[PDB]
């Protein structure tokens, strides 16, 4: 008893991998203003981002 078997196969795979500590990368768009009486040179603010 002889037998010949040919076979064709196709596969499509999708994969989503995600961390849980670095899950997102927010960034801000801000602008400094002045309301005093003197100019400020080399302005650098320390600012807090708070969620709720």
């Amino acid at each position: 008893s002889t037998a010949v078997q040919d076979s064709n196969g196709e596969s499509w795979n999708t994969g989503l991998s995600i961390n849980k500590g670095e899950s997102a990368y927010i960034n801000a768009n801000v602008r400094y203003y002045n309301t005093g009486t003197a100019p400020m040179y080399k302005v650098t603010p320390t600012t807090n981002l708070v969620l709720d």
């Binding site: 961390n19 849980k20 500590g21 670095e22």
Partner: protein
Amino acid sequence: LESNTAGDPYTDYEKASGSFDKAIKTEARDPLVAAYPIVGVGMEKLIISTN
């Protein structure tokens, strides 16, 4: 016999006359009291990132 009675950097005359930093409470005016901050840290709450 000592320039600084209390030990703080400002001397007797500087503390008495008020010719030192103007943000220091009047309780430090006399030489016997010492200008000495006691800065402390109070915890509010932690956030834990589970990786």
